[PDB]
Amino acid sequence: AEIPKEMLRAQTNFILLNVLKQGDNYVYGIIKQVKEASNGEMELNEATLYTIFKRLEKDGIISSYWGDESQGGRRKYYRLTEIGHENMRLAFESWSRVDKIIENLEANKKSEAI
Amino acid sequence: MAEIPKEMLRAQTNFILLNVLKQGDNYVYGIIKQVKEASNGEMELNEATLYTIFKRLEKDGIISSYWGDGRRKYYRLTEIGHENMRLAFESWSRVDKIIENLEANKK
């Protein structure tokens, strides 16, 4: 028994989208904030973020831009796009539909048992 | 490209099917019928999609099958499958707690 590999990836995706929903961010800052928000229990691998962010950018869910150039830097920031905001709405609504189906399955089982 | 991607659609169907079996052992035509009724007639899942998913779940030991007393082939959630659903529920709750803490810091 274990959390399957696909579900771990889905959980990381979900967390990252919510981080960017809070505000634009960079990879090292995201990792640090998630570690703090998990009381040290969730230490995201930067390689994992690079893989996920490549996919999300391909799908138009996030975009990127350079920051810190005025200070002599060149750091990649990520932001949730309007398409990304809609994707998060659709994810919430579609999982709500799934929950409703499962609620009806349970209710239909009680009805028949009676 | 806002639509629900194939991976999340697969996760949604997986969750529905595992919850059917958690409620009780069942055979494929009965599962499809119950999901159709629970979706107000709108979701009549195609058998092939279900067999694709069941192939993976059976290979991973999450479900098994046996004959009833022609005979119907019944599927059951295994003890590992039940534990997996508990572990998934708890891991997603930790995810929710992380997001609550992330939101509090923004606030």
Contact A37 B102 (CB under 8 A): yes
* DSSP 8-state symbol, B71: P
Task: Provide CB contacts within 8 A for B100, sequence distance 6+.
Answer: none
Beta-strand pair A75-80/B26-27: unpaired
Residue of B59, B95, B102 to mutate for A, most A C-beta atoms under 10 A: B102
Q: Which helix (H) or strand (E) holds B26?
A: strand B26-27
Taking CB atoms and an 8 Å cutoff, what residues of chain B touch A42? 94, 98
Contact B98 A38 (CB under 8 A): yes
Q: Which CATH class is domain A1-114?
A: mainly alpha
CATH entry 1.10.10.10 includes domain B1-107: yes
CA distance A70 to chain B (A): 25
> Any bridge partners for residue A25, and if so which?
A78
Name the 3-class secondary structure at B43: coil
Question: Which of B32, B74, B78, B98 shows the shortest CA–CA distance to A105?
Answer: B32
* DSSP 8-state symbol, B3: S
Residue A44 and residue A28: Cα distance in Å, rounded? 10
Residue A17: exposed, middle, or buried by beta-carbon count in 10 A (0-12, 13-18, 19+)?
buried
Q: In this structure, are residues B11 and A6 in contact, taking their beta carbons and an 8 Å threshold?
A: yes
3-state secondary structure labels for all residues of chain A: CCCCHHHHHHHHHHHHHHHHHHCCECHHHHHHHHHHHCCCCCCCCHHHHHHHHHHHHHCCCEEEEEECHHHCCCEEEEEECHHHHHHHHHHHHHHHHHHHHHHHHHHHHHHHHC
Measured between CB atoms, does B90 come within 8 Å of chain A? Answer: no
Question: Which of B38, B36, B23 shows the shortest CA–CA distance to B75?
Answer: B23
Residue A17 and residue A33: Cα distance in Å, rounded? 13
Other Cβ atoms closer than 10 A to A20 = 24
Residue A78 and residue A62: Cα distance in Å, rounded? 7
Which residue of chain B is at minimal alpha-carbon distance from A102? B16
Residue B96 and residue B98: Cα distance in Å, rounded? 5
Domain spans of chain B, in order of start:
1-107
Measured between CB atoms, does A87 come within 8 Å of chain B? Answer: yes
Name the 3-class secondary structure at B94: helix
Residue of A6, A38, A102, A103 to mutate for B, most B C-beta atoms under 10 A: A102
Residues in chain B: 107
Residue of A54, A101, A102 to mutate for B, most B C-beta atoms under 10 A: A101
Residue A19 and residue B96: Cα distance in Å, rounded? 12
